[PDB]
Every structure is written in structure tokens, then in C-alpha cells.
Amino acid sequence: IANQPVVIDNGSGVIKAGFAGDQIPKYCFPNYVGRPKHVRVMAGALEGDIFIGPKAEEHRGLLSIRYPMEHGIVKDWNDMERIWQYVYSKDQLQTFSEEHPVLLTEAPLNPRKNRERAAEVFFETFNVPALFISMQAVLSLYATGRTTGVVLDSGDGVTHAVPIYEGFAMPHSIMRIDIAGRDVSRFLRLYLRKEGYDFHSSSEFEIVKAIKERACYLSINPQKDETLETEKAQYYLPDGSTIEIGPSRFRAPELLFRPDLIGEESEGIHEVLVFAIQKSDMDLRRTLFSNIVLSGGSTLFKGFGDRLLSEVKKLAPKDVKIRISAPQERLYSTWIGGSILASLDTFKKMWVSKKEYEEDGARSIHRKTF
Amino acid sequence: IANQPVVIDNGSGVIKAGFAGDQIPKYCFPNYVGRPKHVRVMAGALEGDIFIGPKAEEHRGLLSIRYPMEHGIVKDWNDMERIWQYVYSKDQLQTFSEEHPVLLTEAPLNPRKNRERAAEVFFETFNVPALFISMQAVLSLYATGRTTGVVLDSGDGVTHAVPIYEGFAMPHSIMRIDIAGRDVSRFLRLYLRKEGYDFHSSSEFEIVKAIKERACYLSINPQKDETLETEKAQYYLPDGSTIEIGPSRFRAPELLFRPDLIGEESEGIHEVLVFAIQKSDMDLRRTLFSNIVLSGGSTLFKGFGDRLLSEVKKLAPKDVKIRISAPQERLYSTWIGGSILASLDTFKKMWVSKKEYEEDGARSIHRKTF
Amino acid sequence: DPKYADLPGIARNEPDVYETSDLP
Amino acid sequence: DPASGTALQEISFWLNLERALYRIQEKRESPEVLLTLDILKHGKRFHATVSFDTDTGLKQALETVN
Amino acid sequence: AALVVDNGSGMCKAGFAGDDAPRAVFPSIVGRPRHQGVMVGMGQKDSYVGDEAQSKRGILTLKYPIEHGIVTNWDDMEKIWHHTFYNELRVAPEEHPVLLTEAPLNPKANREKMTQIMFETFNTPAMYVAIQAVLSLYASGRTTGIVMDSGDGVTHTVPIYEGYALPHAILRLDLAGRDLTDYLMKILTERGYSFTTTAEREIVRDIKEKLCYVALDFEQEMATAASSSSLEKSYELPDGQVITIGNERFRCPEALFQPSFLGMESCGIHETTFNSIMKCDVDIRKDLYANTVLSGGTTMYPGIADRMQKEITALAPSTMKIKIIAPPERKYSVWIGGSILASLSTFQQMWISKQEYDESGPSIVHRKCF
Ligand SMILES: Nc1ncnc2c1ncn2[C@@H]1O[C@H](COP(=O)(O)OP(=O)(O)OP(=O)(O)O)[C@@H](O)[C@H]1O
Ligand SMILES: Nc1ncnc2c1ncn2[C@@H]1O[C@H](COP(=O)(O)OP(=O)(O)O)[C@@H](O)[C@H]1O
Ligand SMILES: Nc1ncnc2c1ncn2[C@@H]1O[C@H](COP(=O)(O)OP(=O)(O)O)[C@@H](O)[C@H]1O
């Protein structure tokens, strides 16, 4: 039957969820499963083995965090099943899995097997009435109130650029590169090892994520700023320690614009955006340059878009008006857009029937993938 | 200068030194400062109060062992200055610390301030004409005559694997975990405390080290031998007391393959090597699996190579010729390679001249060292 | 706005439109 | 009584038992109620939570209805 | 109907489960009289145990059976257990399960022979051996915190966060109350009061329990005690003799904070707790600095929480809430916790039944201890 549908954004690091017709995701919690790595002696301790949810951040000094989704592709399927059940848990949604149409998102160009296996989970473990899997870009266009644009996002693990012109998506112009937030944080962790801090545990890694979200900032000209010393921010650990970052506060998010630093022949995020535009036709290049829509949490770096303008302006043709729109709700654009598309009747004319899935299987979702 | 440089293998356990162009380091003494804990009463007693070298080993009971280099990082600059002066004194080399170039080894991925303050000592306290800090892996390859090969070493305190394919060291595949010989010795002390034989004096921890180096065999089957019962062979202390070792002899060196025992999530030695090989490229891991070079004293356990073959065969893909190639003068391989590098005509081009450091400083050090 | 406060991370005090200048 | 009146009385009975008992479990899991239990144990009234659950049959009733 | 026996190196606090205060509180001492060729007549025992030996202490030789948490004489400990069961509680141990308290990092032979004796000698149906710090945390009414236990023969620190222990961050120090008794005996001999035999050790420890307090600023207190004389108090021996002690009062527990006075070459109790906190995870150190719990009889010194708080305050960072918890019932914290644990509704599955010892043997204790 069709009750109020549920939108779930499988952000490779932060999963965002809520019902359709809403206006904000009230269920935002990081994506992992934390199991304890210590010994239990005192009866009356914490509860349960796995610790998905806010309890993880509340007791991170005990857990051994494991990420289920690496680069948008799920590795530990059992963890994603536990996370999805936690989304339907009594602390997050309280509904039953056999009650709502599910609007699952997905990073573009993910392997076929990922969609297939997600279908198996949602129609065998959960017995959902309906399911639809879509691109993350289209949703951001819904949440940004537009129809034409190039959604250049940066989730926690996959950055990509999808150029959509007047609601028509151009698949051959999609550029995907697997270097996002986790790689920025991982590279920053390596820099702190060279600064003498040796963060190597799992909880230490999420402390690095907190640093990346708070102390880093992007460059404008990394040589102008490389020849001069900087602020050297003093971040305080929860323990009470004191860490200094130095020039790595701007060298850490340089990995996005240049994967040569991490030792990887790939393209910058600017090259992804510019190529994604240029892989398309010629009559549309000017309009796509005039409508660049960001989303994704790894575009929230301070001083990011200004460097993006200097970069694309350095690459795009002469005097073309490059116009980047970056809203405040970039972190939830895919969720808000999922709510917008799921709050329609075309959505009823757009999902995949449970019966039809049982009759067909993988071929059903690969036909209705767009 | 028109003289010969000094190759100092600044390890954490045995600070080996000697002139360049030699074949065996003539002065091998442990890396610790011995300060007396008692009070001298009778005249004619020993003086100086800072015993280093064979004086500290000849009289351990008088002095308190203090190590200056903890996990490859210098923690006591005063003690390292005293050890360096001890190297340049008449008891070890008789030369001057201002008339010879210095080849200073260093573990990879160490903090920047270690290199900075180390060269500050050698160029401010000592006024050396030229200092060249270097990796230990490159030097081991220099001594073995090879050019390819993955150097998997394990010193007293730092384990690391630096893959090199014909002189091109990949600076991103380098793995490094601070779990080696000294920490294994400390874990062994904990095991002996669990057995009933306690040792708590600093001058007694080296007796624990001797127990580590004499009867500690690595078993091929960890849990299959853990559930069994050995014959509990004995050991003779320097006091003359007999100690039954028990199961600690095989459960203590397993820390190099299971760092969870000490209570720290990280990888084992085999996972360090396998991940260091897998972080490289596709067209290079076959030669690297066929070229594995060991080093470090913590790789001298009984059955270490056999267990490496078993673990690597469990992780490496099927039908790949694995070849572990260790040398016979394993404890001196890095120093021999340092001798070969410093005895080259090209060595004058890659150091840091004193005038260069006086002109720039730290930037020149980081510019010329890996 | 409260709706853009109640959430954990939001670009507070940042220009929303990035665009090249005039003088084509 | 399992034989009292109509069968819908049994249906609504067990159904409302699940709903009411779960709401009671939610009341117990509230932060102030758990703060009361924490203050009782911190004030050295050791078996506070033990006597709070054992005296009732919330676990048994929830297991039976679920 | 459970029995809680707290066998320390000093007192032997025993009683029934559920009770607030223990019934049996007596010094665990055994003593053989001065064996001479002469006779005695009209009867006397062979080895006085408990208060018998404490009152007849003028001629018998006090021999503790437990040295630093290690049962050094199983026959004397068996005599103390037989005295406890059949004379202080006046109930056979076959009708009740017993609960023993051992120190952490205790050599396995004690933990196993204790079980062998409790089953083969007394025919008990169930026995469990718990760590004293865990029970102190139970009696402190918290499931999160670090316990700085200090007995007369052992002193250890065990951090437990949310009911889970950290078996690797547990330290242990043999510098406890008996060593303080020996130090006070030596300095009282230095002031002109020779307390040579073991019978005088109870008098010097009585002096320690009555007129010894922890100095806040030891150097300032020592200078004022050498300057003024109002701090010098008087004390009466069992004889009509009266003594005066000036430095000894505050200089006696100074060894706890400064182990250099006994040549231990170790860390004081404050930095032992500090190091035990630092060996934990960086995200749960706030709770440990706030829930620091003192226990044992050696923490009963007047004005010791101030010294601990000042020392940790100087060691821990400025933004931490250093809080020391010292209840007035910390002399029986281990027993109270044993009572709470034994009276729990969950603990019934945590026992070790007789048939389990009949099947496995002494090796089941390690799989059932903690
Ligand atoms: N008021 C006091 N001030 C200082 N020290 C005291 C005081 N009362 C007792 N003590 C010391 O405390 C010790 C008591 O030991 P405790 O009560 O901790 O029992 P235990 O045998 O050490 O076993 P456990 O550590 O498990 O309790 C004795 O050594 C005694 O000297
Ligand atoms: N204020 C910030 N500054 C920099 N990076 C941020 C900030 N907030 C979030 N991030 C990055 O965004 C990531 C969140 O990933 P996200 O974009 O939510 O994935 P998805 O969008 O697919 O859910 C975080 O891991 C973090 O690295
Ligand atoms: N037979 C052995 N078994 C185990 N450990 C050994 C043996 N021989 C030496 N060691 C350890 O190896 C260490 C020396 O390794 P080395 O590579 O020389 O360290 P460094 O490079 O810091 O001098 C010593 O600490 C010693 O504990």
C-alpha cells in the first residue's frame, strides 16, 4: 500500500533520512557500526554489541568503528543491513519495514552488483511495498529549485559531476572520481603523524574528521600561502590536549583539487567539473557554465568556492560567465530533493513494485534505473 | 672536508657507528644513558655519573637505565647529545665532531621536528661540515646490492615496510607501526609478571631483553599451540636463579603479528608488508612479492620467516612466487649500506653543507632528505 | 533562520553565489 | 478472561497491551527517569534498578505480548 | 546466601552477602610461638590466627601468608580460611557459594591454587574470584571511572568505562602499606626508637594508622616541622612509655607519592593513576578525571585527596575537571562491592560450579575470572 514514503540517503560517512513530505532530515547520524573492543566485567554496562547511531559519538572511546560503505560501494553488507534496521529502529523512525515506499539514493556509476544486492536487502530482509533508486544529482536540483545545471557534489567518499540540462540528464558526460572527505581526512591524519600526534585508532580517526570539518580551509594560491607561515590553529582534543596544525590546515584539502599529492593519477575536482561540461554538446556549454550547483558535505570547506571560481575560470573559455550557486543546505540537498520527488504522484508512477521485483529481480531495477 | 665521513646508525636499541668505507661497524653500543641510583661512599669509586657504552653494561646494578629514543622519536635531547658526544669522545672514535660529514640514519615517517632538532644539534652544538639524514630501507638495499625489493625491517622500536622498485621509492605505500622489540620486551615483562617472576627495575628490563633474545620461538600455528601444553624449558638468570619460562616464550613474540595483545588496534608485520605491496601498482606487485628483504633485529626469532611465508601466502594471490631474502649480517645491514652510500663520489652532492644550513635552516634539511 | 540552525553543519555567513565579474 | 465476550476484545486486548507496554518502556527509557535511577544508585541504593525491574513484570509482559 | 571474603595482604574482611558492614574484620596473621625445650602446660594452641595472635603477639612471631597479593604459604592461608569459615562467620562453606577478591595482574598460580583449595579442601559448591578494583567501583555506585586501590601489599589502578574494563591500561605497583610500615620503622629507629622484631611492626603500623597524615606541600611542611615544633604529637605504646614524632607523621606516607625514598625507581601513586589514564582511549579521559575513586585501607590517611588532586591537576591539562572521590567507607569498598555483586540477580550465572571444576580443573578460572 502507499503510506508516507521514506527517503534514505546512503551518504558514505553520514546517512541522512526521514519521511517524505518533510522539510528537513531529522535523522542524521554517521554511517558505521561500532563494536566494543574492550573487556566487560561490571554488570550493568552499556547495552548491545553494535553501536550505530548517536550512542557511538557518545561513547566513542570504547568502540572500534568500521565503515560499511567505501567509495559509495558497500563492502560489509551485514553492517548496512544493521544500519538500515537502525534507521527503522525505535530511536529513529519507529515504522515497520512493510509500511513505506523507500527512496534510496546512490552515487552515480556504482557497480551493478550494488543495486542488485540493495534490492535483495530491501525486498527480502525488509519487505518494503515499493523501492526506487536514483541519482543524487537530480535530487539536489529538486532541492535547489531548478531544472538545468551541473551538480558537482562531494560526499564523504565520492565526488562527481552530473550535468543535467532541462531535466534531461546526459549520461556520457558524467565524471566520477573516488576522492572526497575521507581522503581529505586520511591525508590530514598522515600529516598529523608527521607533526607528531600519531592518530591511528578508529576514534582518533573521527577526531581527525572533526578537525577537517573545523580547522582546515582552502587555499587561493598555494604557493603564495606556502611561502608564508600561517595561523597555526590550536585545536583542543576532548581529552584536553592541544594540537597545532600549521600549513597543513590548507595543505590537507588540496587533495581534492590535486590527487597527485596522495600519489594518484586522476583529475582534480575542477577538472571533473570542466570535463563534465565539455563532454556534453556545444550549445549547452555556456548554460552549464552559468549554472553550477554544489552539494555534498565536502564542499563546505571555508574558502572553497572562491578557489573553484579561480580554477574553472582559469580553465573555461574567455569571459564565459561561470556562476556557482552554493546554498546553505548543501548537506541535505540530496535528502530534501528525495523528499520533494517522493512527495509526488509521479513517484507512485516511478518506483518499482514489490510484486514486479519478485517476478523479475535485478532486471527490473536496471530497467527502471532512470 | 678531505677526510672520511661517519655513518651513524642511529637506531633505537643499538646506536651503531663507525667511519665510512668500512665493512663492519667497529663501535656497537646500546642506546641508553646510565645514571647511578645509589650513593657513593667509599673513595676511589667510579665517576662521571653518566655511563654509556660497555661501562653501563659492565655495571648495570649501579645505574638506572633510561632510554632517550622511544619508538624512534628522540624524547631526551640531553641524553642524545650525551650519546652523540660519547660517540665522538676518545672512548669511541677519538676524532672531532667538526671535521667529518655525518650520515645519520632515521626511521621513515618520523616527525619533522626530529629532523629539525637533530640537525640543530649537529649544526649548532657540534659544527659538522655536512649532515645527510636518510632512510633505513634505502641503505639496506644499498648494502644488499639490489635495487628492487621491499624492505621489511623491525628494529627495537619501529616496524616499517618501504617498497622500492629500481630506486623509485613510493612515498605513499610506506606503512609504519610503533610495535617492535622494545615493546615486545615490555609485553614479555608483563607475561613474566603473570607467570610469577617479576622484574621491575630498569636495570632488570635488560635482563628481560636477554630472555627475549634467547628463548622465544614463533610458532607457526598460534591457537593450535595456544591450546596445547609445552614442556616448560628453563632459563638461567645472571644471578644464577633458574626460571621456568612456560607459554610466554611463544605467546609474547606473537605481538608482532597480533598487535591487539598490547591493546592497540593496528596491523601486524605481515599486514604491514602486504598492505605496503598492495598500495603499490598492479604492474609492480609481482616483483615485489618475489623480492622481500628483511632487516632489523626483531626478525631474528625462531620461525619468523616461516610464519611470514604462511601469513603472506594466506594474503597474497594464488600462484605468486614469494621470496623472502634476508641477509646474514642483519643487524649491520643498514650500517653497511650507509658505508657504501657515504663512500661514494656522488655523496658530496646530496648532503647539506654547513653554509646551506646557515643560509636557510630547516627548509634545506627537509629539501634534501626523504 | 531556525530551520538552518537546528541542523549540525550549515554554511553560516558565506556568500551563496559565486560568479565572475562583469566587463566581458 | 480469554473467553470473555467477543474475540475482538482479545484482539484489542493484546494489541493495546503491546502498545501500552511499549509506551511504558519508552517512559522508562526517558532521560529523567533514568536520571532518577542513576541518582538512586549513586546515592548507594545499590539494587535500585534491580528492584525497579524485578518488582514489575515489564520484561516478561513485553516478551509475552511481543 | 553467599559469602564474601576479602583476602588482602593485611586484614581479612569477611561477612555475608547483602550486609552493609562485614562481620569478620581481623588481621590475617598466623604465628608460631618461640619453640624452646621448655613446656607450657594446661593447654594452648599450636598456631594462633586472627585476634588471637594479635593479643598474644608478645611472644609469637607474626608471619603474614600473603606478600604483595601473592599467597606465599598455602598452609597458613588455609589456616586463616578455616579460622574464618568455622570461627568468625560460624557456618560451614559447603552450604554457601563464596566470593574471593584477588589483585589484578596476579600470577596465575595464586588464582588457580585458590580455586583448588576452595573446592578440594572445603567442598564448596561455587566460587568466583573478582578483581578488588572492580568491586570498589561497585561499592562506589558508578559504572565509569578509575579505581586507585591501595592495600598494604599491593597498589593498582584499573580504569573501567561504562562497565567495560581496559585490561591493558591496568597498572600495578608493589609500593603499598607494608612498605610504608617498614619505612616508618626505619625512620623511627633513626629517631631513637628501635622497633626490631615483627611484634613491634604492629605497634609501628598502629602509629602509622593513628598519627600519620599526607602533607600537602611536603617541602614546606618539612621546613616548618624542622622550624617549628607544634606539629610534633605524642603517642603511648602498650607499655607506659610515651614517644613523640615530628617528621614521621607526614614523612611516612610521602613514599607513596615519592618512591625514591625506598629506592623503588618507580612512579608515585598520583602519576601511576595519571599514566593509567593516559594509557586509555583519548575520548574517555574526561570521565576518568572526574570519576577517580580511591579505595583500600592505605588511602585512609587524613588529607590525601588534596595531594592527589593537586598532583593530578599539575599533570592533567588545565581544561580538565579533576575530581577525587574518597568515601569514608573506602576501607571496606572491596567487601561492600563483593556484597553487591554476590547479591545480584545476574551473578548466578557468573559462578563456577563444583562439577565445572570436576570436569575442567584449575584452568577454568582463567576462562571465568573476568
Ligand atoms: N587511618 C589510617 N590511616 C592510614 N593507614 C591506615 C589507616 N587505617 C588502616 N590503614 C592501613 O591500611 C591497610 C589496610 O589494608 P586494607 O584495609 O586495604 O586490607 P588489605 O589486606 O590490604 O586488603 P584490601 O586491599 O583488599 O582491602 C593497613 O596496612 C593499615 O596499615
Ligand atoms: N564544515 C565542514 N568543513 C569541511 N568538511 C565538512 C564540513 N562538514 C562536513 N564536511 C565533510 O563532509 C562529509 C559529510 O559527507 P556527506 O557530504 O554528508 O556525504 P553525503 O553528502 O553523501 O551524505 C564529512 O565527512 C566531512 O568530511
Ligand atoms: N634473537 C633475537 N630474538 C628476538 N629479538 C632480538 C634478537 N636479537 C636481537 N633482538 C632485538 O632486536 C633489537 C635490535 O634491532 P635493531 O634493528 O638493531 O634496532 P635498532 O635499529 O634500533 O638498533 C634489540 O632490541 C633486540 O631486542
CATH number of the domain that residue E243 is part of: 3.90.640.10
Handedness of CA A214, A220, A222, A224 (dihedral sign): negative
Burial class (CB in 10 A: 0-12, 13-18, 19+), A85: middle
Give residue for cell 600519489. A263
Dump the DSSP string for B292-307. Answer: EEEESGGG-SBTHHHH
Look at phi and psi of residue E172 and say left if phi exceeds 0, alpha if psi is from -120 to 50, else beta: beta
Give residue for cell 524485578. D54
Q: Say how far apart CA A330 and CA A143 lie, in whole Å.
A: 9
Residue C9's Cβ-side half-sphere holds a number of Cα atoms within 13 Å equal to 21
Handedness of CA B134, B138, B140, B144 (dihedral sign): negative
Dump the DSSP string for B271-297. Answer: HHHHHHHHTS-GGGHHHHHT-EEEESG
Quote the cell numbers at residue B212: 627475549
Burial class (CB in 10 A: 0-12, 13-18, 19+), A247: middle
Per the CB < 8 A criterion, the answer to whether B77 and B121 are in contact is: yes
Burial class (CB in 10 A: 0-12, 13-18, 19+), E113: middle
Q: Say how far apart CA E280 and CA E167 lie, in whole Å.
A: 10
Encoded amino acid at A368, one letter: K
The C-alpha torsion from B94 through B80 and A192 to E276, rounded to 10°, is 150
- Report the number of distinct structural domains present in chain E: 3
E5 shares a domain with E122: yes
E32 shares a domain with E105: yes
Q: Say how far apart CA E233 and CA E228 lie, in whole Å.
A: 12
- Cβ pair A42:E143 closer than 8 A: yes
> How far, CA to CA in Å, does A154 sit from each of A68, A149, A297, A299, E313?
18, 16, 6, 6, 44
Per the CB < 8 A criterion, the answer to whether B347 and B341 are in contact is: yes
Label the pairing between strands B130-134 and B352-353.
antiparallel
Q: Considering CB atoms only, which of E167, E168, E265 is closest to B37?
A: E265
Distance from the C2 Cα atom to the nearest Cα atom in chain A, whole angstroms: 11
Taking domain A1-136+334-368, whether its CATH number is 3.30.460.10 is answered by no
Q: How far is CA E121 from its chain centroid?
A: 25
Query: Which ligand places an atom closest to the C-alpha of B70?
Result: 3
Q: Say how far apart CA B320 and CA B280 lie, in whole Å.
A: 16
From the list E279, E288, E338, E287, the residue with the least C-alpha distance to E146 is: E288
E244 shares a domain with E149: no
E139 shares a domain with E71: no
Closest atom of ligand 2 to A15 CA is 23
Q: Considering CB atoms only, which of B110, B170, B265 is closest to A64?
A: B265
> How far, CA to CA in Å, does D39 sit from each of A221, B319, D46, D48, E211?
57, 64, 10, 9, 36
Distance from the first to the final alpha carbon of chain B:
24
Domain with CATH 3.90.640.10 in chain B: 179-266
E350 shares a domain with E297: no
Residue B273 CA to ligand 3 centre (angstroms): 19
E161: nearest CA partner in chain A: A62
Q: Whose CA is nearest to atom 4 of ligand 2?
A: A213
What lies within 8 Å, CB to CB, of A365 at 6+ separation is A115, A116, A119, A131, A133, A352, A357
- Within 10 A of E15 (CB to CB), how many other CB atoms are there? 23
Chain A: partners with 3+ C-beta pairs within 8 Å: B, C, E
Q: Say how far apart CA D34 and CA D23 lie, in whole Å.
A: 15
> How far, CA to CA in Å, does B103 sit from each of B8, B22, B155, C22?
6, 13, 18, 59
E148 shares a domain with E45: no
B14: helix, strand or coil: strand
What lies within 8 Å, CB to CB, of B99 at 6+ separation is B1, B3, B129
What lies within 8 Å, CB to CB, of E236 at 6+ separation is E242, E243
Breaks in chain C (C to N > 2.5 A) come right after: none
- The residue segments making up the domain with residue E50 are 1-132+334-370
> How far, CA to CA in Å, does B285 sit from each of A130, B150, B277, B291, B307?
46, 10, 6, 9, 20
E113 shares a domain with E30: yes
* Chain E neighbors of A207, CB-CB under 8 A: 282-283
- Cβ pair B194:E265 closer than 8 A: no
Distance from the A259 Cα atom to the nearest Cα atom in chain B, whole angstroms: 12
Look at phi and psi of residue A156 and say left if phi exceeds 0, alpha if psi is from -120 to 50, else beta: alpha
Quote the cell numbers at residue A330: 548543501
- Within 10 A of B27 (CB to CB), how many other CB atoms are there? 16
Per the CB < 8 A criterion, the answer to whether E291 and E327 are in contact is: no
Q: Say how far apart CA B234 and CA B232 lie, in whole Å.
A: 7
Quote the cell numbers at residue B95: 676524532
Look at phi and psi of residue A38 and say left if phi exceeds 0, alpha if psi is from -120 to 50, else beta: beta
Per-residue DSSP letter, E88: I
E65 shares a domain with E110: yes
> How far, CA to CA in Å, does E44 sit from each of E59, E61, E99?
13, 15, 32
CATH number of the domain that residue E166 is part of: 3.30.420.40
Q: Which regions of chain E does DSSP assign to beta strands (E)?
A: 3-7, 12-16, 30-32, 48-49, 61-63, 66-67, 70-71, 98-102, 127-131, 145-150, 155-161, 164-165, 171-173, 233-236, 242-245, 292-294, 324-325
E188 shares a domain with E101: no
Q: How far is CA A309 from its chain centroid?
A: 22
What lies within 8 Å, CB to CB, of B350 at 6+ separation is B132, B368
- Cβ pair A41:E163 closer than 8 A: yes
Per the CB < 8 A criterion, the answer to whether B347 and B153 are in contact is: no
- Give the orientation angle of helix D7-28 with respect to helix D58-65, to 10 degrees: 140
- Bridge partners of B163, per DSSP, are B150
Encoded amino acid at E304, one letter: I
Q: Say how far apart CA B301 and CA B96 lie, in whole Å.
A: 39
Q: Say how far apart CA B308 and CA B294 lie, in whole Å.
A: 11
D29 phi/psi in degrees, rounded to 5: -80, 10
Radius of gyration of chain D (CA): 16
Cβ-count burial E75-99 (b if 16+ within 10 Å, e if not): ebbebbbebbbeebbeeebeebbbb
What lies within 8 Å, CB to CB, of B15 at 6+ separation is B8, B9, B29, B30, B31, B83, B87
Interface test with chain E among B198, B251, B264, by most E beta carbons within 10 Å = B198
Per the CB < 8 A criterion, the answer to whether B67 and B78 are in contact is: no
Residue E213 CA to ligand 1 centre (angstroms): 14
- Within 10 A of E143 (CB to CB), how many other CB atoms are there? 20
Domain with CATH 3.30.420.40 in chain A: 1-136+334-368, 137-178+267-333
- Give the orientation angle of helix B269-278 with respect to helix B304-315, to 10 degrees: 40
Per the CB < 8 A criterion, the answer to whether E282 and A203 are in contact is: yes
What lies within 8 Å, CB to CB, of C9 at 6+ separation is A213, A297, A300, A331
From the list E143, E79, E155, the residue with the least C-alpha distance to E117 is: E79
E150 phi/psi in degrees, rounded to 5: -150, 105
Query: Which ligand places an atom closest to the C-alpha of B72?
Result: 3
> How far, CA to CA in Å, does A203 sit from each of A57, C10, E156, E280?
9, 24, 27, 12
Burial class (CB in 10 A: 0-12, 13-18, 19+), A95: middle
- Give the orientation angle of helix D7-28 with respect to helix D31-42, to 10 degrees: 60
The C-alpha torsion from B84 through B87 and B91 to B96, rounded to 10°, is -90
- Cβ pair C11:A325 closer than 8 A: no
- Bridge partners of A74, per DSSP, are A69
A179-266 to CATH, choices 3.30.70.640, 3.90.640.10, 3.40.50.180, 2.170.150.20: 3.90.640.10
Q: How far is CA E352 from its chain centroid?
A: 25
SS3 content of chain E, % helix, strand, coil (to 5): 40, 20, 40
Radius of gyration of chain C (CA): 14
E299: helix, strand or coil: helix
Dump the DSSP string for B36-97. Answer: E-S---STT---SS-B-THHHHH-TTTEEEE-SEETTEE--HHHHHHHHHHHHSTTTT-S-T
* Chain B neighbors of E263, CB-CB under 8 A: 37
Per the CB < 8 A criterion, the answer to whether E289 and E322 are in contact is: yes
Look at phi and psi of residue E267 and say left if phi exceeds 0, alpha if psi is from -120 to 50, else beta: beta
E64 shares a domain with E40: yes
Dump the DSSP string for D5-65. Answer: S-HHHHHHHHHHHHHHHHHHHHHHTSHHHHHHHHHHHHTT-TTHHHHHHHSS-HHHHHHHH
Q: Say how far apart CA E199 and CA E182 lie, in whole Å.
A: 13
B227: helix, strand or coil: coil
Taking domain A137-178+267-333, whether its CATH number is 1.10.3720.10 is answered by no
Query: Which ligand places an atom closest to the C-alpha of C14?
Result: 2
From the list D49, B115, B334, B175, the residue with the least C-alpha distance to E344 is: D49
Q: Say how far apart CA A204 and CA B275 lie, in whole Å.
A: 21
E148 shares a domain with E28: no
Question: Chain A: which residues have CB within 8 Å of chain B?
Answer: 37, 64, 193-196, 198, 200-202, 262-263
Host H or E run for residue B181: helix B181-195
E367 shares a domain with E258: no
Of E245, E267, E289, which residue sits at a domain end?
A: E267
Per the CB < 8 A criterion, the answer to whether A296 and A143 are in contact is: no
* Number of Cβ pairs < 8 A linking chain A and chain E: 90
- Bridge partners of A63, per DSSP, are A36
Interface test with chain B among E111, E156, E161, E168, by most B beta carbons within 10 Å = E168
Of E223, E246, E267, which residue sits at a domain end?
A: E267
Breaks in chain B (C to N > 2.5 A) come right after: none
Q: Say how far apart CA E4 and CA B149 lie, in whole Å.
A: 62
D25 phi/psi in degrees, rounded to 5: -65, -35
